Symmetry: C2
Subunit: 333 residues, 2 copies
């Protein structure tokens, strides 16, 4: 039933189509704009990494280990596995008296083609540090170590870290997080399906502080402001999240999830954004978060023009010929 | 009409993502055997119709003149991984026509297969036109021109006699109208022509059976389909669905992927052609859909059926090797 949110053209015709859902919620919980089904439970995957970084800050670990915005950004990141990402994750772990062996996420090659070419040339195999979640896992291990909680088995459903993350994420989103909503993430931690409406509300609360206690309100500001200050560390070279946060420095928060999830926030407008490409395609979610953010910057021509470049992405073939476009539909008007 | 949900992607107890699409199954006589969703709206077959495009290579007399075997015919029909074996053979086909990589007008790209791109990164500064998944098809085009003494320069162009011939061939096989209105530019810079899945399926069924084809075309069609089943590594390569699906039932199943979630298939002993499209263009959806479609025809061949159903319902494991959910064709296929 979800509307067609993205078209992919070739010649004079639409070659492929994507359906999806978009929730835009203010800090008080009012729905500002919606497309399609924002009530059915959806897996946020990596899109809610900023929510999961709150124990790192709220525990006092970030302060105890003298982390700045680059380590905060990396803990909120789906990074490319570039040398800067690896080194920082290694550094975050070392400051907690730990190494790569403490990571329980496993290893993978970069999903970014140019970075995988760099990795393939310089490595026999990637390590846990090269995992896009290695920053988030580093932050988890630091959160544990700072409070003298054994980080071994931190991925486990009833490890006190995962108990803390449920409690935090239920408070932010007002969603029920439990066994029936639970799945295993690519990094072997729990991911909880919840309505896009609730996920949007969670990010609006972090962005605005509305309904949050002072410590949580402050920790949420530090994380959102870190990602916007150090956008390379959230993603990296050639990535949409990094480029989208260089359009309007310090003003727009975005984060991708696996399976075509995007979360975003505009703290100055007090709004949180969540969305899902029903088929899970990254290119669709990317076109959709751009067209959605653009609705709020129509009277800022240069920002609007920069966002609309991601909402209407040209495709060139191997000879650099324009063959067609990836275009958000009129539903974003 | 809305296309039905053909593939679900699960995580824990829930459907995380879903795909819609369409399937046409047509016999040699043009009778519809099975269909899902919209099989009348024009769809770009992209690489899925490479075997139809290989007909000038055979029918011209070029394949025989240059002593091409099943491996060369398979490669001409291929979206290959850009492995050393594919590169060497594409180089060999060009060599026999008195040409080299500089004759190719497809451009260069890194392997879309992760393991092979790693090999390529470690062995190359940059790929060449030979590394292009379409280098075999383009080698065949150039070979077809060179044999008939037609200047291969500009063979990608709409009114080059090669592209005029491909149009005439594909219109005769499919019964579809191929013109500028239905034309787009493919990833390799040649024309790709949108046509109904029903017509694409009918096309492959005529190649598979020879029904309504003149003897020359019927024989070239047989040679190409038999070559791809004989040498499935040269159609795709290491770790690829097309190669593995054509090792389930050797000599019996023809499959070919197209960009944007197209699949074509054929079971010549059953007289059927298959075409399908994941509406969102996902590869994983088109793969689950072609396997679930083929499986309907092998329900009394338990070992073939179980091998196809492994692709119809593919498990997903995370970086630690933990089963997280499945990619499953829906009950519309059973
Ligand atoms: Cl993930
Ligand atoms: Cl709170
Ligand atoms: Cl292509
Ligand atoms: Cl293309
Ligand atoms: Cl004919
Ligand atoms: Zn993760
Ligand atoms: Zn091609």
């Amino acid at each position: 039933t979800n509307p067609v949110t993205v078209e992919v053209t070739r010649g004079l015709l639409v070659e492929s189509r994507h359906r999806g859902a978009v929730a835009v919620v203010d800090g008080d919980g009012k729905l500002f704009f919606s497309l399609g089904d924002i009530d059915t439970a959806v897996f946020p995957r990596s899109a809610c990494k900023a929510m999961q970084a709150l124990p790192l800050v709220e525990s006092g670990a970030a302060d105890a280990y003298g982390f700045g915005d680059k380590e905060l950004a990396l803990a909120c990141a789906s990074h490319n596995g570039e040398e800067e990402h690896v080194a920082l994750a290694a550094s975050m772990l070392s400051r907690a008296g730990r190494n790569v062996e403490a990571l329980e996420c496993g290893a993978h090659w970069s999903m970014n083609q140019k970075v995988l070419i760099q990795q393939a040339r310089s490595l026999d195999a990637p390590t846990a540090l090269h995992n896009n979640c290695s920053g988030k896992h580093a932050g988890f291990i630091c959160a544990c170590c700072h409070r003298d909680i054994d980080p071994k088995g931190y991925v486990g459903y009833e490890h006190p870290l995962q108990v803390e993350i449920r409690a935090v994420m239920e408070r932010l989103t007002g969603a029920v997080l439990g066994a029936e909503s639970c799945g295993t993430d690519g990094c072997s931690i729990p991911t909880y399906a919840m309505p896009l409406r609730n996920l949007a509300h969670g990010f609006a609360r972090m962005a605005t502080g509305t309904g949050l206690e002072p410590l949580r309100a402050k920790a949420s500001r530090r994380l959102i402001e870190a990602c916007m200050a150090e956008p390379f560390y959230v993603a990296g070279s050639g990535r949409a999240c990094t480029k989208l946060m260089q359009i309007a420095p310090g003003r727009i928060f975005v984060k991708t999830g696996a399976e075509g999830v995007f979360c975003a926030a505009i703290p100055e407008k007090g709004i949180g954004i969540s969305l899902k490409s029903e088929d899970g395609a990254t290119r669709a979610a990317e076109a959709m978060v751009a067209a959605t953010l653009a609705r709020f910057f129509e009277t800022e021509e240069t920002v609007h023009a920069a966002l609309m470049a991601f909402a209407a992405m040209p495709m060139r073939n191997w000879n650099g010929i324009h063959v067609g476009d990836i275009r958000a539909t009129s539903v974003f008007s």
